Design a protein around this ligand. Structure first.
Ligand SMILES: CCCCCCCCCCCCCCCCCC(=O)O[C@@H](COC(=O)CCCCCCCCCCCCCCC)COP(=O)(O)OC[C@H](O)CO
Ligand SMILES: CCCCCCCCCCCCCCCCCC(=O)O[C@@H](COC(=O)CCCCCCCCCCCCCCC)COP(=O)(O)OC[C@H](O)CO
Ligand SMILES: CCCCCCCCCCCCCCCCCC(=O)O[C@@H](COC(=O)CCCCCCCCCCCCCCC)COP(=O)(O)OC[C@H](O)CO
Ligand SMILES: CCCCCCCCCCCCCCCCCC(=O)O[C@@H](COC(=O)CCCCCCCCCCCCCCC)COP(=O)(O)OC[C@H](O)CO
Ligand SMILES: CCCCCCCCCCCCCCCCCC(=O)O[C@@H](COC(=O)CCCCCCCCCCCCCCC)COP(=O)(O)OC[C@H](O)CO
Ligand SMILES: CCCCCCCCCCCCCCCCCC(=O)O[C@@H](COC(=O)CCCCCCCCCCCCCCC)COP(=O)(O)OC[C@H](O)CO
Lengths: 799, 799
């Protein structure tokens, strides 16, 4: 899907650029500049106002999603999440940070579930998507003649299509209303409908109406931003209709911004009626104001909140896995876009004239080319930044400063230089955000990032051909080094960019194959065992089974056991070591899964590492609850119903003649354990002789055994393998672990772990007999929240 | 001394600047520029060659010092130390990194003693100093008429003075040769002479001659650098004579470079004969070529070796305390000098003309002023860099980049911008070098750094008055903002610099008084005890006496006990904690001693921290040797004469009826210990009840006791207080500690410490009875290696 999807995305973008070139054949870059200058200042204020209103409406859009999801959030939190998710989501789309990914980060702080947020994301997306046909049909149904003239279709055709769409909408509404199950309601404003296979959660009448009213205002507001920037305007009905169709086309095309396809359609519709230059100026300004501007504001706002959090909560925040890294990848990617577009466009004659006297003329040429190569590097380095490489941080920050300098030496492009500097200043402030010391050369290949770069370089060649159309091409142009020669400086830069990008991408893709997964050897198992001993987490003992691969840190103070099943790679617990080592190992595991084209899954993780799992792009799903008794507050002279039941079990066990013995590793009765294991029925001598075995006996004869996970410290201790005979008494087992607890209380262990119950009722009650302290255990899995998949699933179930 | 010395240094510099202004009254900056352009290219090559020869001679100068000191070093090491120490020493003098400080750092790697190096430094300095009168006299004695005409003195006078100097030199040589003690010789090429009070170590005849021949060539070579840059030249005899006198005056004046006083004297001598412009051009070029150039080369070379060491030895080097920090302080200080001098000098009319079209004219003014303030900040921040503040690193690196930018916006000063950029690029490479996270606002006041800044700002106003002499001053000049107005841009900058410098210096000096030293409270003692437990070093137990101040880290994972005696502040051991915590605490202690105007002394330190003590500017003196027995290789079934003597002592002790008992803290027989302490004669219950006490008894009655320093780990354990009765057997004590060793061997301790012997013979033998492992213990003290003090001491002893 990914490769095909990405290819058909690039084609669409490419075809759209061709379309835009043909539609602006009769216009020169002069006429565009004049058209941009022409639009009055009241119109720009009108646009900016309409933009502000149109982004306030999206907050209410976010509120409705929370009501649907049954999520209570503070107003300031909904506001921020509404704005940032819609502002970044609309701009960069899927390429970099998406709407869902923003929502999830932001709304994980308040303890909103991963399921809820997903259901908030889906509702935010689908509600526009599914309203867009209805809104369009209605728009066309006012003044059909104008709509017909705009689309250049027969009046009868567009009439029946609109009617058909409305009728189908009504028929669908009536159908899903038919299967409305009464009684139960997930949220105040929701329904649960049934179709036979799956239950489906739909908004209520009131919420559906309200959402449609919000969607209506939002569209209108957005279309109005464009409508005000047009000197001469068509009837608004037809103009809205077209805008909605262009918007649809942009969405379907899966082009990040909608860029190219949107413009192409608008241009197509109103090529002749309005004229190219006014429309093309309006479309550019519309993009800057309604798309780029709120993105920058959102980016800044999120960086600001990050910076604040670092300033106030200095102690709490340690490893830094927040918003700075994605946001700064975006800004650095935009910085590379600026550099590349700047180069394609010719310079101001006045500036070149004067800068010719300050600089050697042949250095202008050199500066111009180098700036364009740095631009390409900036596009690719954006990935490295996203993955929190310190190398990437340093190299970027150098290239931005050199790029800002060569911006001044090129054509005194002080606007480009100012943007690049400002990006550098931001990137600098967040040095600690990029904390991984991995090599840049070991970043896994990302088709998306390569696809994006190719698009940008494509756009820049489109701009080159448009901006330098006044010159007659010739073979000699390539070798002209003058000052007045602006076209040759474009050409050479263009070729340089394309070649470097091609080279890097080939040098990235044609790389050595990654080594195969192998079970650990004796040395590794011994090194794992060492780490486990000099650590807190005893659950790490399962590593020493030697049936699952071990991934070691560079410092070799930490490791992370995992195993490949099907197309996924399941890690068994959190990494084993300090917080920084844990963060580096989680990133290492992402890297390792990306190199093997496998889905990174983490099994049974604690809540303390959930932000790091968020960082590499996983969602925490509530797997099960792990019960662990506290030995500090546990005493055998206390009172309680369950405590009295336990003391009864204990004393009855002692009177019966049950005895408990502890054997250190190496001196275990292997013959007995084998016989017991066989009677019950991994169990290997190598695995068993790593741990201390507690054996309980009934009147001398061994009645059960259990190996004990334990570290050199006394913070925690667990049990993994534990088998009892069918013929053994029922209270013997309960006596056993009670004996284990007593022994650990004598040794002065802080805590003791029993185990995890998933979702079992009998096991849950049995654990609850000791009155333990519960703690949630999560599962980490990738975030598969594609609107299209969900809509296709809904449509399939409905049909 | 320091304040007086610094004041009389500034006065001399000031008076010299006045002198230089008066001597260049008849010359304009035009005539100087022409004179600089005039000097031919063969002459510059001749100068550069003579410089290279004159720095090769200094290597042989360094060799002779090693022979005198009796130090064997590799040729490449002598070379580097010769060059760097003479190149930096000559340039910056005493202000920043000095010759001795370079030698000590460089020659500590090879395990050259602190005493040796000091003796190498003194010999390197004094040999020139004491040869300069002889060389001068001899020079004057060739062609007396020319020498008389140059000095404008009578021929008879200069004749008798020269003769007197030579006669006194011969008479001194004969006198010190009289008291030449035969037999013993510290080195092959040395003598030991006696005068009654102190023994004095002088070079041999052969070494004295050779040194004089080296000194002769070196001077000649240096004078020749200047002689070639003169179009019209006086007789070389007289020219040399003057150069030596000017050199003397420069040295005596204690002006860092010799700058001002040297030029003043040369100028004075050859004002009229040669003409101002040629001479003043020669003197400037001489400074650049023979002083500034080798300094930059040395700086680069030392940075290169640092960079290499970081690249190759990544694992070994951890905390980074080498050459980068001092060297980069110098470069940053020079960067501030460039900015300040650039501002005082008017701009090129051509560049302003063209840059007027690219920039707003009133932004040139703003850029010009801001650049001059950044210059001043750069001068002061140089200190912060030296003390390895990360804040200083970040702030500098920002100011250098902004300063480089405003250099371009000012008058397109692309040379200033290039230097500043290059400094920034270097500073960036060594980010890790500046690792302390202290506040900038808490740096202690350094009069020297303030004095240096005032000199620079003084020089810049001297340059302002010289470079802008063509304009008529008026009150209105201050308020003229034009483009062609270069003098007002100087004035405003000058005033701004002076005011900012004054303000900062007052804001630095008038600061709150530092809190007084107080003994620790119960909480601190308890927190110290905690640290000691969770650590390796048990010697830290002496902290819990509570008679000595404790200095804690910010993390509170480390501390450093110290006590004030007289005018010094003695720390008792190394800091207690990790390597990074140790480095930060040592710097903290330097800071604390600088705020109380006390000499930082470290007592009984290990060799592992010696580089950090080097960093804050201490010299390791061999205090004593600490013996610690290794329990891994120690066994009671081994063979050996001493081992058989120990086993005999043990079994005889057991048969006699000696018994050893171990009491945990809290359950000590206080009554007994008190009685034993009284019988022997800090001893307090609070101090005693922190440690486990081992009590040996003779037939039941307690015969001795000894508290045991110990941590939670088993890496090491010691004994501090240990008293025995006069009437107790002689072998009872030896049995006691043997019992202690046996007990620690049973507990599985890695090592065990006995104690330190200073320089005692009986104690040394007693320790050697157990066949221990010796390890040197050092004392850290400031480096008081002022040539003048040593010469005054020598002169006083001779007389
Ligand atoms: C780092 C330093 C980069 C080079 C700085 C400028 C070089 C010295 C100035 C000079 O003479 O440059 C020549 C520049 O000549 C060149 O060939 C320039 C290319 C070399 C610089 C390439 C990197 C520049 C951008 C980074 C101009 O001579 P011309 O070719 O106009 O004469 C005919
Ligand atoms: C009309 C002319 C206008 C001139 C411009 C005037 C205004 C300039 C204002 C610039 C201020 C922005 C720079 C702030 C960056 C944050 C500093 C920082 O933290 O830097 C980090 C990175 O280190 C740096 O030094 C980075 C320097 C890069 C800064 C780049 C931005 C300045 C750009 C200036 C113009 C450059 C030239 C462009 C045109 C060619 C170090 O972080 P740390 O955590 O390691 O250390 C913190 C320390 O412990 C204290 O707590
Ligand atoms: C034309 C619209 C209709 C058809 C659309 C379909 C075809 C798409 C392909 C082309 C789309 C973009 C074309 C126009 C974009 C701007 C062109 C432009 O002017 O580019 C300038 C440079 O390129 C841009 O400005 C690109 C703008 C787009 C992206 C901007 C992102 C902003 C953020 C960047 C990172 C900074 C982050 C820190 C800030 C918080 C260079 O030209 P200049 O002559 O104006 O500049 C020279 C001199 O400096 C001043 O005159
Ligand atoms: C950070 C940004 C610093 C300012 C960048 C330039 C300001 C906009 C350009 C402009 O109009 O500047 C005026 C600059 O006006 C000023 O007053 C300049 C001083 C403000 C800048 C001070 C800091 C500059 C150096 C850093 C020029 O107008 P005029 O005063 O020549 O008109 C009469
Ligand atoms: C004719 C035009 C010529 C144009 C110039 C062309 C040549 C430019 C070459 C510049 C290269 C020098 C910069 C190298 C600096 C070392 C990078 C570095 O390590 O930076 C540290 C500081 O971080 C930075 O990003 C500092 C950036 C500052 C660099 C400043 C020098 C460049 C100046 C360019 C011109 C600026 C404009 C001047 C005029 C206004 C980060 O160290 P770290 O240990 O934290 O990270 C290491 C990582 O883990 C990998 O192992
Ligand atoms: C005059 C000599 C006899 C009398 C001496 C007694 C009086 C002493 C007081 C003055 C001493 C210095 C006077 C002359 C120094 C240089 C003057 C000069 O030219 O200054 C320029 C700037 O100042 C300097 O160059 C100062 C040089 C001295 C210190 C240099 C240190 C070098 C290292 C700096 C740090 C960089 C580190 C990285 C490199 C490895 C600005 O003038 P400009 O018109 O030449 O420049 C404008 C334009 O850019 C090009 O024309």
């Amino acid at each position: 899907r990914q490769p095909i999807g990405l290819v058909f995305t690039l084609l669409l973008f490419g075809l759209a650029l061709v379309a835009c070139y043909h539609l602006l054949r009769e216009i020169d870059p002069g006429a565009l500049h004049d058209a941009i200058a022409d639009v009055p200042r009241p119109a720009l204020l009108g646009a900016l106002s309409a933009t502000a209103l149109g982004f306030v409406i999206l907050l209410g859009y976010e509120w409705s999603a929370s009501r649907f999801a049954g999520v209570t959030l503070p107003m300031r939190s909904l506001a921020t999440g509404g704005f940032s998710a819609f502002a970044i989501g609309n701009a960069v789309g899927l390429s970099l940070l998406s709407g869902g990914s923003v929502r999830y980060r932001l709304y994980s702080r308040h303890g909103i579930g991963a399921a809820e947020i997903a259901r908030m994301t889906l509702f935010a997306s689908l509600s526009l998507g599914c309203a867009l046909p209805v809104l369009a049909a209605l728009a066309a149904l006012c003044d059909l003649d104008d709509a017909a003239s705009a689309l250049h279709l027969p009046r009868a055709l567009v009439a029946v299509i609109a009617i058909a769409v409305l009728s189908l909408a009504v028929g669908l509404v009536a159908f899903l209303a038919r299967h409305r199950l009464p009684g139960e309601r997930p949220s105040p404003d929701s329904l649960l409908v049934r179709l036979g296979r799956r239950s489906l959660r739909l908004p209520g009448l009131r919420l559906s109406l309200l959402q449609l009213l919000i969607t209506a205002l939002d569209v209108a507001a957005a279309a109005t931003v464009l409508y005000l920037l047009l000197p001469e305007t068509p009837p608004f009905a037809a103009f809205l209709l077209v805008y909605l169709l262009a918007l649809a086309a942009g969405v379907l095309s899966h082009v990040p911004g909608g860029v190219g396809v949107f413009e192409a359609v608008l241009l197509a519709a109103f090529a002749g009626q309005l004229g190219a230059a006014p429309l093309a100026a309006a479309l550019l300004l519309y993009r800057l104001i309604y798309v780029v501007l709120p993105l920058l504001l959102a980016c800044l706002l999120l960086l600001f909140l990050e910076a604040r959090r670092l300033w106030v909560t200095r102690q709490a925040i340690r490893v830094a896995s927040g918003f700075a890294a994605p946001i700064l990848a975006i800004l650095v990617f935009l910085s590379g876009v600026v550099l590349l577009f700047s180069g394609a466009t010719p310079a101001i004659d006045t500036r070149l004239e004067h800068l010719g006297f300050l600089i050697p003329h042949r250095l202008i040429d050199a500066s111009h080319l180098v700036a364009s190569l740095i631009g390409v590097l900036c596009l690719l380095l954006a990935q490295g930044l996203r993955r929190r490489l310190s190398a990437a941080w340093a190299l970027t920050l150098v290239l931005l400063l050199v790029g800002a300098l060569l911006s001044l030496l090129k054509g005194f492009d002080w606007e480009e230089a100012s943007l690049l500097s400002l990006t550098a200043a931001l990137l600098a402030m967040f040095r600690r955000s990029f904390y991984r010391p991995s090599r840049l050369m070991e970043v896994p290949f990302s088709p998306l990032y390569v696809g994006a770069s190719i698009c940008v370089v494509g756009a820049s060649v489109w701009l080159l051909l448009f901006a330098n159309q006044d010159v007659h091409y010739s073979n000699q142009l390539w070798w002209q080094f003058a000052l007045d020669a602006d076209a040759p400086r474009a050409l050479r830069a263009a070729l340089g960019s394309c070649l470097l990008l091609l080279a890097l991408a080939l040098g990235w893709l044609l790389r050595a194959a990654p080594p195969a997964i192998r079970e650990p050897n004796a040395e590794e198992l011994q090194r794992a065992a060492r780490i486990i001993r000099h650590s807190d987490q005893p659950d790490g003992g399962l590593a020493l089974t030697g049936d699952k691969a071990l991934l070691f840190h560079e410092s070799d103070d930490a490791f992370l056991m995992y195993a490949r099943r099907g197309r996924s790679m399941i890690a068994l617990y959190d990494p084993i070591g300090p917080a920084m080592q844990r963060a580096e190992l989680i990133w290492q595991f992402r890297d390792l899964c990306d190199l093997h084209h496998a889905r990174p899954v983490f099994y049974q993780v604690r809540a303390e590492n959930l932000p790091f799992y968020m960082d590499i792009g996983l969602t925490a799903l509530k797997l099960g609850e792990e019960a662990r008794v506290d030995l500090l507050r546990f005493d055998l002279e206390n009172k309680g119903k369950e405590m009295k039941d336990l003391r009864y079990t204990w004393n009855r066990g002692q009177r019966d003649g049950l005895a408990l013995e502890f054997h250190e590793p190496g001196q275990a009765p292997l013959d007995e354990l084998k016989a017991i294991s066989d009677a019950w029925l991994r169990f290997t001598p190598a695995y068993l002789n790593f741990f201390r075995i507690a054996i309980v006996r009934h009147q001398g004869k061994p009645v059960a055994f259990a190996n004990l996970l334990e570290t050199d410290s006394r913070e925690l201790a667990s049990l993994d393998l534990m088998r009892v005979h069918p013929d053994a008494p029922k209270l013997t087992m309960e006596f056993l672990m009670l004996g284990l607890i007593l022994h650990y209380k004598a040794q002065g262990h802080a805590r003791f772990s029993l185990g995890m119950v998933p979702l079992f009722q009998g096991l849950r009650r049995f654990k609850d007999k000791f009155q333990p302290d519960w703690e949630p255990r999560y599962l980490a899995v990738p975030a598969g929240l594609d609107p299209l998949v969900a809509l296709a699933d809904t449509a399939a179930l409905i049909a």
